[PDB]
Protein backbone atom coordinates (compact mmCIF):
# COMPACT_ATOMS: atom_id res chain seq x y z
CA UNK A 1 0.00 0.00 0.00
CA UNK A 2 1.16 3.31 -1.06
CA UNK A 3 -0.07 6.67 -1.60
CA UNK A 4 1.38 9.50 -3.66
CA UNK A 5 0.89 13.39 -2.85
CA UNK A 6 1.45 15.33 -5.98
CA UNK A 7 2.38 18.98 -5.59
CA UNK A 8 2.65 21.53 -8.53
CA UNK A 9 3.82 24.91 -8.87
CA UNK A 10 3.38 26.15 -12.36
CA UNK A 11 4.86 29.18 -14.90
CA UNK A 12 4.78 29.94 -18.37
CA UNK A 13 6.92 26.92 -19.59
CA UNK A 14 8.31 24.75 -16.82
CA UNK A 15 6.59 23.46 -13.62
CA UNK A 16 7.82 21.95 -10.18
CA UNK A 17 6.52 18.80 -9.24
CA UNK A 18 7.13 17.86 -5.45
CA UNK A 19 6.29 14.53 -4.75
CA UNK A 20 5.38 12.72 -1.59
CA UNK A 21 5.51 8.79 -1.30
CA UNK A 22 3.10 7.61 2.07
CA UNK A 23 3.99 4.28 3.09
CA UNK A 24 0.61 3.20 3.82
CA UNK A 25 1.06 -0.09 4.39
CA UNK A 26 2.29 -2.11 7.93
CA UNK A 27 6.07 -3.66 6.34
CA UNK A 28 9.01 -1.03 5.96
CA UNK A 29 10.46 -0.04 2.56
CA UNK A 30 14.53 -0.52 1.87
CA UNK A 31 14.46 1.25 -1.70
CA UNK A 32 12.04 2.18 -3.69
CA UNK A 33 11.01 3.02 -7.17
CA UNK A 34 8.01 4.72 -8.55
CA UNK A 35 6.65 5.03 -12.03
CA UNK A 36 3.82 6.89 -13.89
CA UNK A 37 3.35 8.46 -17.50
CA UNK A 38 2.96 12.09 -18.01
CA UNK A 39 -0.23 12.77 -19.77
CA UNK A 40 0.39 15.82 -21.55
CA UNK A 41 3.93 15.59 -23.35
CA UNK A 42 5.92 17.27 -20.03
CA UNK A 43 9.83 16.23 -19.95
CA UNK A 44 11.96 16.33 -16.98
CA UNK A 45 14.52 18.28 -16.97
CA UNK A 46 15.88 18.40 -13.36
CA UNK A 47 15.68 16.16 -10.35
CA UNK A 48 16.84 16.35 -7.00
CA UNK A 49 16.31 13.49 -3.99
CA UNK A 50 16.23 11.17 -6.43
CA UNK A 51 17.25 9.73 -9.53
CA UNK A 52 14.91 10.17 -12.66
CA UNK A 53 14.50 8.21 -16.31
CA UNK A 54 12.11 9.13 -18.78
CA UNK A 55 11.45 7.70 -21.91
CA UNK A 56 8.64 8.65 -24.01
CA UNK A 57 5.95 9.62 -21.89
CA UNK A 58 7.24 6.77 -19.46
CA UNK A 59 8.98 8.25 -16.06
CA UNK A 60 11.35 6.23 -13.22
CA UNK A 61 11.88 7.76 -10.50
CA UNK A 62 14.69 5.96 -7.98
CA UNK A 63 15.87 7.10 -4.44
CA UNK A 64 18.55 8.68 -3.45
CA UNK A 65 21.30 7.08 -1.20
CA UNK A 66 19.92 9.25 1.99
CA UNK A 67 15.89 8.31 1.53
CA UNK A 68 15.76 4.86 0.67
CA UNK A 69 13.82 4.04 3.85
CA UNK A 70 10.68 4.29 4.63
CA UNK A 71 9.20 2.78 7.85
CA UNK A 72 5.23 1.64 7.93
CA UNK A 73 3.21 4.91 8.20
CA UNK A 74 6.33 7.58 7.20
CA UNK A 75 7.07 9.45 3.75
CA UNK A 76 9.84 10.22 1.76
CA UNK A 77 9.99 13.32 -0.46
CA UNK A 78 11.62 14.15 -4.13
CA UNK A 79 11.11 16.56 -6.68
CA UNK A 80 11.63 16.98 -10.09
CA UNK A 81 11.68 20.24 -12.58
CA UNK A 82 9.87 20.08 -16.20
CA UNK A 83 8.75 22.05 -19.35
CA UNK A 84 5.44 21.70 -20.62
CA UNK A 85 3.66 22.91 -23.39
CA UNK A 86 -0.11 23.76 -24.06
CA UNK A 87 -1.59 21.92 -20.96
CA UNK A 88 0.17 20.22 -18.24
CA UNK A 89 -2.32 17.40 -16.80
CA UNK A 90 -0.93 15.63 -13.45
CA UNK A 91 -0.32 11.75 -14.11
CA UNK A 92 -3.49 10.06 -13.13
CA UNK A 93 -1.87 6.43 -11.78
CA UNK A 94 1.56 5.62 -9.75
CA UNK A 95 3.13 2.58 -8.75
CA UNK A 96 5.98 1.64 -6.18
CA UNK A 97 7.49 -1.06 -6.44
CA UNK A 98 4.94 -2.83 -8.26
CA UNK A 99 2.40 -1.70 -6.52
CA UNK A 100 -0.55 0.31 -7.25
CA UNK A 101 -0.63 3.60 -5.57
CA UNK A 102 -3.57 5.80 -4.21
CA UNK A 103 -3.78 9.91 -4.67
CA UNK A 104 -3.77 12.33 -2.31
Same mark, same amino acid.
Given at each position: ???? #???? $? /?????? &???? =???? &?????? /???? #??????? @??? *??????? =? *???????? &? *?? $????? +??????? &?? /?? @?????? =? @? =?? %? %?????? #?? +?????? @?
Amino acid at each position: GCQV #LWGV $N /QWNTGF &TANV =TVQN &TSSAPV /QGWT #LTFSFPS @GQQ *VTQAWSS =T *VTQSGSAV &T *VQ $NAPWN +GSIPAGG &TA /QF @GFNGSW =T @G =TN %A %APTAFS #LN +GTPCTV @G
